[PDB]
Amino acid sequence: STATLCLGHHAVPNGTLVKTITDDQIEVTNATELVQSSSTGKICNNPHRILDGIDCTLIDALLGDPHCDVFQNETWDLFVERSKAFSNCYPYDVPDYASLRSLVASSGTLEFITEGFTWTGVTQNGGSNACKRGPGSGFFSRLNWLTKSGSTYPVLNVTMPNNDNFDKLYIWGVHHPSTNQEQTSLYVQASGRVTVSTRRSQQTIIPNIGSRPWVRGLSSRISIYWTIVKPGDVLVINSNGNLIAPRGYFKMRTGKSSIMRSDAPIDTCISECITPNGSIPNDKPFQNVNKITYGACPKYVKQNTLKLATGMRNVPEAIAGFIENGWEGMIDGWYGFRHQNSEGTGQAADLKSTQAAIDQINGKLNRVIEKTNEKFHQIEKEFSEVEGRIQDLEKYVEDTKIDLWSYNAELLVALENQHTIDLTDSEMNKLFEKTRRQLRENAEDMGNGCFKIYHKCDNACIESIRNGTYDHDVYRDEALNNRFQ
Amino acid sequence: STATLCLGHHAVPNGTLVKTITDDQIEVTNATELVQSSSTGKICNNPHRILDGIDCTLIDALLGDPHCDVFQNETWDLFVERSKAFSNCYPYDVPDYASLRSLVASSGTLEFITEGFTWTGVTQNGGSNACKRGPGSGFFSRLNWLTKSGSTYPVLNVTMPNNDNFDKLYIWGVHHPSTNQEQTSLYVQASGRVTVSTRRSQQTIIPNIGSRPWVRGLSSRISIYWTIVKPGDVLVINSNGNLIAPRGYFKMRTGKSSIMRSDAPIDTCISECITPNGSIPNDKPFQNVNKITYGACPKYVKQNTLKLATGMRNVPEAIAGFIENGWEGMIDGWYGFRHQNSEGTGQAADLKSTQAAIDQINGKLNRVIEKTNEKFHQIEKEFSEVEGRIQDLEKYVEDTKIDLWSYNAELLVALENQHTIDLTDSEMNKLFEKTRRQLRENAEDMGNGCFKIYHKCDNACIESIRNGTYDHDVYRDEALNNRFQ
Amino acid sequence: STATLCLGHHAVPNGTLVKTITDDQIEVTNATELVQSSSTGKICNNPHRILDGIDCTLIDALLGDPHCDVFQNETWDLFVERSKAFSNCYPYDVPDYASLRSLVASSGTLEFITEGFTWTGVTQNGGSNACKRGPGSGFFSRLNWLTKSGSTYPVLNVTMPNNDNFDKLYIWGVHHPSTNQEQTSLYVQASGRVTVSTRRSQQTIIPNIGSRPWVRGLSSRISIYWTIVKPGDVLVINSNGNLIAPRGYFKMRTGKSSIMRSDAPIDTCISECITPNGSIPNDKPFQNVNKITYGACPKYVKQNTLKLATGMRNVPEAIAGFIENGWEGMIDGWYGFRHQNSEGTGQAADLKSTQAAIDQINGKLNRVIEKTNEKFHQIEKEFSEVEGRIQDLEKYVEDTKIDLWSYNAELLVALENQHTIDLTDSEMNKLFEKTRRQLRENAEDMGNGCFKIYHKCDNACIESIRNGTYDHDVYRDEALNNRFQ
Numbered sequence A, B, C: 001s002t003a004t005l006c007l008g009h010h011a012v013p014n015g016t017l018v019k020t021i022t023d024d025q026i027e028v029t030n031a032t033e034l035v036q037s038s039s040t041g042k043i044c045n046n047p048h049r050i051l052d053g054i055d056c057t058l059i060d061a062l063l064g065d066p067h068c069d070v071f072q073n074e075t076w077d078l079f080v081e082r083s084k085a086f087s088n089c090y091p092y093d094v095p096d097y098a099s100l101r102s103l104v105a106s107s108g109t110l111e112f113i114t115e116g117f118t119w120t121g122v123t124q125n126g127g128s129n130a131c132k133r134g135p136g137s138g139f140f141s142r143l144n145w146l147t148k149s150g151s152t153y154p155v156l157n158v159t160m161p162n163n164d165n166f167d168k169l170y171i172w173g174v175h176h177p178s179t180n181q182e183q184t185s186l187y188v189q190a191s192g193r194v195t196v197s198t199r200r201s202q203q204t205i206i207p208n209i210g211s212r213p214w215v216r217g218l219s220s221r222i223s224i225y226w227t228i229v230k231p232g233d234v235l236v237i238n239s240n241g242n243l244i245a246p247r248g249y250f251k252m253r254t255g256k257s258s259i260m261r262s263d264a265p266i267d268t269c270i271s272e273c274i275t276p277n278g279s280i281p282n283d284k285p286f287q288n289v290n291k292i293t294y295g296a297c298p299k300y301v302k303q304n305t306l307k308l309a310t311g312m313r314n315v316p317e318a319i320a321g322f323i324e325n326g327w328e329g330m331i332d333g334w335y336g337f338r339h340q341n342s343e344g345t346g347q348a349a350d351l352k353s354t355q356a357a358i359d360q361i362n363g364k365l366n367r368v369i370e371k372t373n374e375k376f377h378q379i380e381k382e383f384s385e386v387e388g389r390i391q392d393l394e395k396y397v398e399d400t401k402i403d404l405w406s407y408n409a410e411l412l413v414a415l416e417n418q419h420t421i422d423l424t425d426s427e428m429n430k431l432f433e434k435t436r437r438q439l440r441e442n443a444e445d446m447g448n449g450c451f452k453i454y455h456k457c458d459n460a461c462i463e464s465i466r467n468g469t470y471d472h473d474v475y476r477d478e479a480l481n482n483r484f485q
Ligand SMILES: *[C@@H]1O[C@H](CO)[C@@H](O)[C@H](O)[C@H]1NC(C)=O
Pocket: A072, A073, A111, A112, A113, A114
């Protein structure tokens, strides 16, 4: 009479295919997708403060477009700028539009403190029929269209010191009229000038008296410039004409605020990661939704699928063990022992090796990857305009980052899956050689992941081999007589 | 009488040295270079459309330099700009030259549609002796040098709507004369002005009446600007003077087109990857030729050599096996069995383990690397000018990319070679323990990668061990009597 | 009588914790920090030439601020710009300040060659009380404030050819006065002009007659521009007024020079790597001190600690061997043999496997990492100003690089530590199976990393097993009689 102890591992009929260093496509028992390929479709408004620019750009809310009067003094961690947005005030252009938009977005607040500028000998609060405030004519609420008073426009020259402890942002402008008649009617001088200076900075702009396309009934423009006044510094606005003055300063801050062009609707939910396609869950280490991200988002990768083997290698199917096949009928644990003796066939898992493999497998990826990279303000990555050098450089930087992180994700998945598979085979072989070392001369490796044990082995003794208390010398005198004789 | 079965692997006298994680320099049987270090020397003109700018820059072909009249309406996937190139027309400078060059290169076409601009009260088709068209005086063929008609130069003011479904590109200019006499002779106003506007954009340029170096007999210049008109938009050209008008618009496209500064000649061959040094083969995953690439090119790496072990570890040299030495006299396969019995010494490979190792080794690198990264338009990376901030940023981005990809290539080669070596030793040891499991108690591991088999083993039985049909129990009663007695 | 040979490895009570692919926190015998987290606090002035800008910016030393007269013609490999720096001359602003600063820093020399500009009909060597040279009024020493001579300011128009073999750098300026009275008093024309041109370049600047904050007693400014003249080219300075001419040219070079904002003091020591926090040792492959680097510096990584296992796995504690525990009482070598026989217990290391493991472990990281990346001039990474697009792009490039290199460092440490641990366990198991192959049938694996040897084994024979000369057949007839009987 002899016994048989086969060592084995769990298998599943539902084998998931993964990628490794050594195999293009290998079948494992379980796998987790690391690439968030689909979004919720909606921008969840927590924990980040989401400001919906329903029909307003950021610059139109800054300047005070009347339909953006509902954005006076609004703060945000993300400004969602809709493609539906339009302007309904005096036609304007921002030289260096993207820089102003970016610094106002990172500022995270349109907190406008009005200041007592003493514009003397000049008519304030100029207006236009291209911005009906409500009824009648108006203008940007955060600007002051100055025009001649009587028969002259003096050389305006005012100062404003920054005695506070923060950067002030002064949004000013220059009026480019259409005709010299319009110039000399608004500003008596034949060609104006707007200088705005600090102790360390300068901008001087000569207006551009020339006609141009009719936008809301005007062949004139406002060229919007800005000036950042540091603490202790001082602003000076000098002007010979064509000045669109500021009424005050925008309280600059520095923080996690940003801006995002999106058309997805906001919804009352919770999500750390926001994309133009909506909020996504940050549970996975990579994504494929969009490269434009805000918050604790995963990394963007070109790959649409990257399956990490969070389980072992699958070999789905005389009680032969692991050298031949894996066991489908073992859910008690990962690695285990089947056994055949006179007291009846049976099975029992080994939670030691199972729990070792799970302890190594449960926390694999989170010890070579980041928490979830919190990126709040980044470069622009979707361009509507054609600009050339700086746009191509931004595109190239982002494409470089994307290709590098895609390669890193591919190599990481391959390495971690190869290590998972070698680790699980290692635990199986370690259990095998452990049981070999318990059965010094009382057993023989049959070659199918199984020990033929040459003494009568009741289920108590099979359990003794399973749990490690098996003393070989009790049965040695019998097993040698059954092996070599 | 006893037999002897040694297991072994192929070896070669021509051992190639490679790098791993664990060994600085280890000898393997075969190795493939992954870094394309040398070029063909010629730019192959397929599958990409290569336009040879024989003596023409891209901007001189855009504007219509007479010796670039052969580039009217030419399209390309790559514009090869020769260092031999020169200008032979009115001296000019492009403020933001690189941006115009880049967007015209990505445009991939100089398709110029002439438009009926109504320049009234003004003499069109001005010319110069600094561009002989052929005989006589001429000008850029895609521009229109306007000058006074009679005794006055009116305030030119024309419009052109973009009712089409593509971006129009209007290349216009401003004439900077040398003297006020030249100004008031060409343009009656003492100081001109050129405004070019759309519903959302602006450029207004006051000319610069001042002398400057004589280039082709002139101390005057053309400052070339551009304006991109989106669909539905409208262009307006206003001017008080010094206008170099456009005759039409360049049909902007968006695609795989680009530009490359090179002196290599074009040749009728096929190659996906183009560099300034010539076309190179894209068979290898990395390169060292140049960082400037067009097409399906490998990645640039600082390394000049990176040998991937596409073979196993080399140990070149009583029929002792793999624990001692490798076999030079085995080409039948990778892993194999030598044997010594009474019926004569012999040898035979094992195609199972050989083909396993080759199946794992043939497709290693192409399951963690990209297809071949198709990069068409990228930043400029070789600068002739000194520009400071943007140039240093482009250089830093490219050097960052190069160092990162060089490190990735080094780590990848080390990892893949270490995995190759461990994999081949693993297949050898797996075959060894397989043969151990076939020879349960009939054999003994001699310690030189060899089993001394303690029964008479004819060549049929050695083949039985080789192919897996060896049943131990037939010879057990004899082998135990020969081992322990 | 029987003997016992246990194989084992060294252990230490001082176990250092490290990170791997398979274990979050595993205990090893020795570990090296790869992240230089602390600096010396001082900038060591060798081998790089360090120029201490004690109270001088680079532009103030370029132009010739009087308290920077001690920096005439100074050369550097690194210009240390102090936060204590101030200007004490005519108030000025540099449009494109950062580009001029960067190209003058990479130039690595303020070598100023004076040229014989023939400014005729005009008063040279203008001065101001905002730069007392020493006593009296003066100006920038490398500029020439031109003013009217008598009752007229002619149209200045001079040329200067670059007949040399290097780029010349001409630093010129434009005077923006406060009042039209000041303009027409200094420069008779009501609105000046400064054109500076070459055969391929242009800059024309109309001054800005407007008041502005009083800096050192003046509401006027100098707008500093530059012009780089290549070999064979020619400079032409034309001016209707408001010209701040150059007295000569700065000899541009190209090399390892750079600039760094720092407050750390210089000290006479030796160090290749300089940061604003001081010089640091470049012995480690990564750092956490600062991302701003000059010289042969390590790579910046967000991690503050990254311990590389330069030793094996620690298992600190009947002479049981390596399967159970590691040995604390073995310093002779890494892997070794303990033994118990009738001639007394004893111990002896195996320098073969020890030296194999050390040869593999001593040079691990330096065969997948770089020498130490020499980066001399890079982008600016700490910004005092808010600028928007280009600043955000520089920040994003550097943050991308930092996150990528941090991930690479983490993955590299995990991989190299996992390979160290698997390599050391591999050498231990290889020694174990070597000793198994020496003791073919004379021994039995007890299961605690130990062979019970079934013949009397004097210390000479234990040494025979240790050094490899052990012939099994001498003791086989006795060991079989002691094992199976
Ligand atoms: C808007 O902002 C500032 C912030 O202090 C405040 O003083 C001002 O009165 C506010 N006005 C409105 C209408 O919110």
